[PDB]
PDB file of C-alpha atoms in Angstrom:
ATOM      1  CA  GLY A   1     101.546  90.265 166.895  1.00  0.00           C
ATOM      2  CA  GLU A   2     101.818  87.039 165.459  1.00  0.00           C
ATOM      3  CA  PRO A   3     100.357  83.896 167.428  1.00  0.00           C
ATOM      4  CA  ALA A   4     100.791  80.186 167.176  1.00  0.00           C
ATOM      5  CA  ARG A   5      97.489  80.316 164.981  1.00  0.00           C
ATOM      6  CA  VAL A   6      95.414  82.368 162.716  1.00  0.00           C
ATOM      7  CA  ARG A   7      91.919  82.147 160.713  1.00  0.00           C
ATOM      8  CA  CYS A   8      92.349  83.757 157.230  1.00  0.00           C
ATOM      9  CA  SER A   9      90.307  82.762 153.325  1.00  0.00           C
ATOM     10  CA  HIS A  10      92.082  82.527 150.364  1.00  0.00           C
ATOM     11  CA  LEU A  11      90.830  82.057 146.525  1.00  0.00           C
ATOM     12  CA  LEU A  12      92.447  79.064 144.631  1.00  0.00           C
ATOM     13  CA  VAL A  13      92.595  80.007 140.832  1.00  0.00           C
ATOM     14  CA  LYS A  14      95.006  77.159 139.210  1.00  0.00           C
ATOM     15  CA  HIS A  15      96.498  77.485 135.760  1.00  0.00           C
ATOM     16  CA  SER A  16      97.548  75.979 132.722  1.00  0.00           C
ATOM     17  CA  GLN A  17     101.075  76.271 133.740  1.00  0.00           C
ATOM     18  CA  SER A  18     100.235  75.225 137.281  1.00  0.00           C
ATOM     19  CA  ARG A  19     102.228  72.212 138.433  1.00  0.00           C
ATOM     20  CA  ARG A  20      99.044  70.218 138.466  1.00  0.00           C
ATOM     21  CA  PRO A  21      95.949  72.125 136.255  1.00  0.00           C
ATOM     22  CA  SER A  22      93.351  69.691 138.416  1.00  0.00           C
ATOM     23  CA  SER A  23      91.174  70.170 141.218  1.00  0.00           C
ATOM     24  CA  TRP A  24      88.003  68.756 143.083  1.00  0.00           C
ATOM     25  CA  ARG A  25      86.312  71.712 140.337  1.00  0.00           C
ATOM     26  CA  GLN A  26      87.865  70.490 137.554  1.00  0.00           C
ATOM     27  CA  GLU A  27      90.577  68.350 135.721  1.00  0.00           C
ATOM     28  CA  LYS A  28      91.626  70.133 132.886  1.00  0.00           C
ATOM     29  CA  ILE A  29      92.799  73.778 133.889  1.00  0.00           C
ATOM     30  CA  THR A  30      93.952  75.513 130.487  1.00  0.00           C
ATOM     31  CA  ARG A  31      93.795  78.824 131.884  1.00  0.00           C
ATOM     32  CA  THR A  32      96.882  81.113 131.815  1.00  0.00           C
ATOM     33  CA  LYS A  33      98.073  84.075 133.349  1.00  0.00           C
ATOM     34  CA  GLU A  34      95.808  86.361 131.949  1.00  0.00           C
ATOM     35  CA  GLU A  35      92.621  84.641 132.547  1.00  0.00           C
ATOM     36  CA  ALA A  36      94.364  83.033 136.289  1.00  0.00           C
ATOM     37  CA  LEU A  37      94.872  87.404 137.689  1.00  0.00           C
ATOM     38  CA  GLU A  38      91.880  88.359 135.566  1.00  0.00           C
ATOM     39  CA  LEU A  39      89.690  86.150 137.866  1.00  0.00           C
ATOM     40  CA  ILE A  40      91.869  87.055 141.111  1.00  0.00           C
ATOM     41  CA  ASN A  41      91.543  90.532 140.255  1.00  0.00           C
ATOM     42  CA  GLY A  42      88.150  90.539 139.084  1.00  0.00           C
ATOM     43  CA  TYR A  43      87.020  89.305 142.126  1.00  0.00           C
ATOM     44  CA  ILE A  44      89.450  92.113 144.565  1.00  0.00           C
ATOM     45  CA  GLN A  45      87.897  94.779 142.585  1.00  0.00           C
ATOM     46  CA  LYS A  46      83.756  93.785 143.270  1.00  0.00           C
ATOM     47  CA  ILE A  47      84.926  93.282 147.112  1.00  0.00           C
ATOM     48  CA  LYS A  48      86.760  96.858 147.460  1.00  0.00           C
ATOM     49  CA  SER A  49      83.488  98.008 145.472  1.00  0.00           C
ATOM     50  CA  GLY A  50      81.284  96.764 147.912  1.00  0.00           C
ATOM     51  CA  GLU A  51      79.464  95.171 144.907  1.00  0.00           C
ATOM     52  CA  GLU A  52      80.404  91.450 145.787  1.00  0.00           C
ATOM     53  CA  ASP A  53      82.437  89.588 149.022  1.00  0.00           C
ATOM     54  CA  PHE A  54      85.442  87.454 148.541  1.00  0.00           C
ATOM     55  CA  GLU A  55      83.686  84.796 150.459  1.00  0.00           C
ATOM     56  CA  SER A  56      80.823  84.776 148.071  1.00  0.00           C
ATOM     57  CA  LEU A  57      83.388  84.899 145.131  1.00  0.00           C
ATOM     58  CA  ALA A  58      85.884  82.696 146.485  1.00  0.00           C
ATOM     59  CA  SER A  59      83.117  80.071 146.490  1.00  0.00           C
ATOM     60  CA  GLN A  60      81.366  80.552 143.019  1.00  0.00           C
ATOM     61  CA  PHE A  61      85.251  80.827 141.964  1.00  0.00           C
ATOM     62  CA  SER A  62      87.481  78.732 144.393  1.00  0.00           C
ATOM     63  CA  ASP A  63      88.699  75.806 142.746  1.00  0.00           C
ATOM     64  CA  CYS A  64      89.862  74.526 146.001  1.00  0.00           C
ATOM     65  CA  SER A  65      88.100  72.150 148.086  1.00  0.00           C
ATOM     66  CA  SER A  66      88.286  75.442 150.176  1.00  0.00           C
ATOM     67  CA  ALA A  67      84.820  76.385 148.429  1.00  0.00           C
ATOM     68  CA  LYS A  68      83.217  74.393 151.220  1.00  0.00           C
ATOM     69  CA  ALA A  69      83.704  77.589 153.560  1.00  0.00           C
ATOM     70  CA  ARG A  70      83.702  80.229 150.875  1.00  0.00           C
ATOM     71  CA  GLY A  71      88.037  80.134 151.128  1.00  0.00           C
ATOM     72  CA  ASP A  72      87.519  80.536 154.443  1.00  0.00           C
ATOM     73  CA  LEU A  73      89.958  77.781 155.617  1.00  0.00           C
ATOM     74  CA  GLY A  74      88.794  78.292 159.667  1.00  0.00           C
ATOM     75  CA  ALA A  75      91.908  78.855 161.860  1.00  0.00           C
ATOM     76  CA  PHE A  76      95.288  76.949 161.215  1.00  0.00           C
ATOM     77  CA  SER A  77      98.721  76.708 163.031  1.00  0.00           C
ATOM     78  CA  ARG A  78     101.991  77.888 161.341  1.00  0.00           C
ATOM     79  CA  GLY A  79     103.574  75.122 159.051  1.00  0.00           C
ATOM     80  CA  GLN A  80      99.832  73.847 157.888  1.00  0.00           C
ATOM     81  CA  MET A  81     100.127  76.161 154.690  1.00  0.00           C
ATOM     82  CA  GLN A  82     102.778  77.149 151.987  1.00  0.00           C
ATOM     83  CA  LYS A  83     105.277  79.259 153.071  1.00  0.00           C
ATOM     84  CA  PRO A  84     104.032  82.169 151.412  1.00  0.00           C
ATOM     85  CA  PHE A  85     100.734  81.592 152.456  1.00  0.00           C
ATOM     86  CA  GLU A  86     101.735  81.743 156.165  1.00  0.00           C
ATOM     87  CA  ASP A  87     103.755  84.692 155.509  1.00  0.00           C
ATOM     88  CA  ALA A  88     101.116  86.803 153.567  1.00  0.00           C
ATOM     89  CA  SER A  89      98.096  85.487 155.836  1.00  0.00           C
ATOM     90  CA  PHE A  90     100.370  85.985 159.475  1.00  0.00           C
ATOM     91  CA  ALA A  91     101.483  89.486 157.810  1.00  0.00           C
ATOM     92  CA  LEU A  92      97.999  90.914 157.055  1.00  0.00           C
ATOM     93  CA  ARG A  93      96.285  92.918 159.093  1.00  0.00           C
ATOM     94  CA  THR A  94      92.474  92.425 159.941  1.00  0.00           C
ATOM     95  CA  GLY A  95      90.529  92.195 157.054  1.00  0.00           C
ATOM     96  CA  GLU A  96      93.215  92.826 154.786  1.00  0.00           C
ATOM     97  CA  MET A  97      93.898  90.722 151.723  1.00  0.00           C
ATOM     98  CA  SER A  98      97.122  89.721 150.315  1.00  0.00           C
ATOM     99  CA  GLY A  99      98.058  89.788 146.637  1.00  0.00           C
ATOM    100  CA  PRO A 100      98.176  87.176 143.733  1.00  0.00           C
ATOM    101  CA  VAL A 101     100.253  84.764 145.445  1.00  0.00           C
ATOM    102  CA  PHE A 102     101.928  82.125 142.819  1.00  0.00           C
ATOM    103  CA  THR A 103     102.144  78.931 144.330  1.00  0.00           C
ATOM    104  CA  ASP A 104     102.339  74.772 143.528  1.00  0.00           C
ATOM    105  CA  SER A 105      98.794  74.976 142.635  1.00  0.00           C
ATOM    106  CA  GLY A 106      98.485  78.613 141.037  1.00  0.00           C
ATOM    107  CA  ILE A 107      97.485  81.852 142.079  1.00  0.00           C
ATOM    108  CA  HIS A 108      96.172  82.316 145.366  1.00  0.00           C
ATOM    109  CA  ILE A 109      94.414  85.458 147.110  1.00  0.00           C
ATOM    110  CA  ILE A 110      94.317  85.457 151.221  1.00  0.00           C
ATOM    111  CA  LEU A 111      92.764  87.337 154.230  1.00  0.00           C
ATOM    112  CA  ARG A 112      93.137  87.645 157.777  1.00  0.00           C
ATOM    113  CA  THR A 113      90.136  86.894 159.532  1.00  0.00           C
ATOM    114  CA  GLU A 114      90.725  86.172 162.923  1.00  0.00           C
TER     115      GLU A 114
END
């Protein structure tokens, strides 16, 4: 099933090779794939471990404006976010997480809420 809109959460972690290593959180990102995935991966582990939550994590590590809702960008409609986002998001099950997604901004991890 794939409706016209769904709720999902994501964690943005730009890198040094990002199209624009700068966001509302910082203006000089020099974190490479190592430091990049190192953050996302670490976040994934804690969550799957039951120690931390993507919501709490994302916020404290959300380089994007998503940090406001701790990553949760509410319910959106197809054609709003990057293609890879919608697909992975709309392809994940209830309470699922998408692996490291490399996009213009950097590496993003999404999850299906609705």
